[PDB]
């Protein structure tokens, strides 16, 4: 347990956007208290996460410390300005945060952080419709922002306009063909959206996600259940009926195999057997 | 007439603490004034997706009927602090689960009252009558042993047991994580 090890752990926990605020805030506090001078400016990015975790963790005592250090180091910085905006939003102080973001925008119009923070404020206030409208307007100038695209898709899913969410996930897959998570989420959204005309797309995209990653057993039994629903639908044609029955049988075989592997990996009561007891039904 | 065990409340607090930033949901199973003997969590964050909910409910029904329980309640904790009313997902899920047994009623973890010790009962129980869902009396007693629930929730949260808690979503990530989470059950037994 050396400061390099926790530094690498924090770097990994930053590269993939985790939100285990307690662990990251504890590690960051240890780093900035014990090994603050053991390494150079690489802690400064840490000083971002550490405060955000604090706002997530509720421990506001060190949020002021980190903010004051960053401000005294970086006067008139748009990143630190957004960070102050988040500090203000931590206590639902929305008017001052909005004014600060407007000042940032009038100082620099190409900044994208201020728009995202202001729409985060709007969605925190519960005005979902105006938040969706603001995101739609913001994308009209910044088509291609994958993060905002996925956030808009998630908001549409929450508000249950599954057509727009499916469209946004389609264009997200356009952006990133090789991410199986997007394919799985789009298959789920399409399955939830409607019937056979969308069930076919859902099962095709579930198969695509399985091809892109064999371990996504979530999408595995998602494909299984989509095929089963297609089978149970009277409108399915005879050739479609036998095709989806074959797909369901293959998926069931894969599910029994996967749960047998789950069995050999652990050592306990055979709940996985109970699990395939469900498949036999 | 909705009654849930103290372990159900501690599981509620555990799942709320595991993913504080994401809205969560799940089911509560009971044997055939109904007493919710046990509970089970499922997913977090995005909750409007159907396929996971369907596969979940099917697995809950299989596991419960294999071991004589039946699913009899639905819980959902929303993301927003100032939000305490059910959404479409919660309403439809509660209506569908209530189709089997009329005694099934919805419960929602009011995150506004979520504290370290859980001074006041966070859960609010909603009943379906006249084809409408409406809350019960807040002044009613909800847990079977309120001081016991308070102390066990405080001990579990202070023991950092929420990180070890596993819901259905982690089972989906990897089956090696036990979705039946008997670990919190043995911790409850040891604490009691």
């Amino acid at each position: 347990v050396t400061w390099e090890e926790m530094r690498d752990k924090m770097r990994k926990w930053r590269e993939e956007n985790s939100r285990n605020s307690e662990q990251i805030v504890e590690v960051g506090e240890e780093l900035i208290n014990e090994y603050a001078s053991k390494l150079g400016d690489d802690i400064w990015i840490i000083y971002e996460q550490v405060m955000i975790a604090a706002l997530d963790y509720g421990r506001d005592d060190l949020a002021l410390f980190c903010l004051q250090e960053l401000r005294r180091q970086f006067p008139g910085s748009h990143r630190v300005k957004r960070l102050t905006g988040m500090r203000f939003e931590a206590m639902e102080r929305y008017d001052d945060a909005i004014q600060l973001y407007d000042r940032i925008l009038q100082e620099d119009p190409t900044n994208t952080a201020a728009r995202k923070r202001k729409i985060a404020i709007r969605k925190a206030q519960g005005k979902n419709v105006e938040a969706i409208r603001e995101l739609n307007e913001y994308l009209e100038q910044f088509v291609g922002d994958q993060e905002a695209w996925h956030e808009l898709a998630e908001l549409y899913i929450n508000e249950h306009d599954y057509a727009k969410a499916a469209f946004c996930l389609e264009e997200l897959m356009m952006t990133n063909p090789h991410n199986h998570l997007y394919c799985q989420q789009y298959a789920e959204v399409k399955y939830t959206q409607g019937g056979l005309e969308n069930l076919e797309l859902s099962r095709k995209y579930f198969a695509q996600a399985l091809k892109l990653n064999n371990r996504n057993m979530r999408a595995l039994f998602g494909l299984y259940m989509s095929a089963s629903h297609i089978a149970s639908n009277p409108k399915a044609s005879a050739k479609t009926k036998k095709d989806n029955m074959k797909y369901a049988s293959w998926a069931a075989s894969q599910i029994n195999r996967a749960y047998q592997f789950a069995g050999r990996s652990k050592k306990e009561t055979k709940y996985s057997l109970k699990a395939v007891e469900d498949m036999l039904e | 007439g909705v009654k849930l065990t103290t372990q159900a409340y501690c599981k509620m607090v555990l799942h709320g603490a595991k993913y504080p930033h994401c809205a969560v949901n799940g089911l509560l199973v009971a044997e055939k004034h109904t007493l919710f003997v046990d509970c089970i969590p499922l997913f977090h964050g995005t909750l409007a997706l159907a396929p996971m909910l369907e596969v979940a409910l099917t697995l809950i029904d299989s596991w419960c009927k294999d071991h004589s329980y039946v699913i009899a309640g639905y819980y959902q904790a929303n993301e927003r602090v100032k939000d305490a009313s059910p959404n479409q997902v919660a309403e439809k899920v509660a209506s569908r689960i209530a189709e089997g047994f009329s005694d099934t009623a919805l419960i929602m973890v009011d995150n506004t009252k979520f504290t370290m010790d859980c001074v006041a009962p966070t859960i609010h129980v909603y009943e379906h009558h006249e084809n409408r869902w409406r809350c019960r009396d807040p002044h009613h007693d909800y847990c079977e042993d309120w001081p016991e629930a308070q102390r066990i929730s405080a001990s579990l949260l202070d023991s950092r047991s929420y990180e070890t808690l596993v819901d259905f979503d982690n089972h989906l990530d990897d089956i090696r994580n036990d979705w039946t989470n008997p670990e919190i059950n043995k911790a409850v037994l040891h604490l009691c």
Binding site: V129, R133, N136, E137, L139, E140, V143, L152, Y156, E159, H160, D161, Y162, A163, K164, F167, C168, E171, T192, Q193, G194, S228, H229, S232 | A48, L49, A50, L53, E54, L57, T58, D61, Q88, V89, K92, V93, R96
Partner: peptide
């Protein structure tokens, strides 16, 4: 299926790139 819950229903400017009408142009 005893758990076939439907989550669709009410659909509420329009998101950029969206076009509701199913056009057969090819």
């Amino acid at each position: 299926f005893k758990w076939a819950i439907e989550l669709s229903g009410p659909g509420g400017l329009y998101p950029v790139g969206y076009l509701d009408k199913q056009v057969p142009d090819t």
